[PDB]
Amino acid sequence: GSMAEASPHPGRYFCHCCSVEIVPRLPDYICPRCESGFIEEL
Ligand SMILES: [Zn+2]
Structure with a gap:
């Protein structure tokens, strides 16, 4: 899955x-976009 990164690792974030x-x-x-850091790993 997406645990421990792996190949199908996460990427979809929400700023x-x-x-x-x-x-x-x-x-x-x-x-x-804003280089802030306030993002959510979906
Ligand atoms: Zn942003």
């Missing part, structure tokens, strides 16, 4: 600042 679904910059774990 609280943009209130939209995003794919985070993994090296930073931030938003690709």
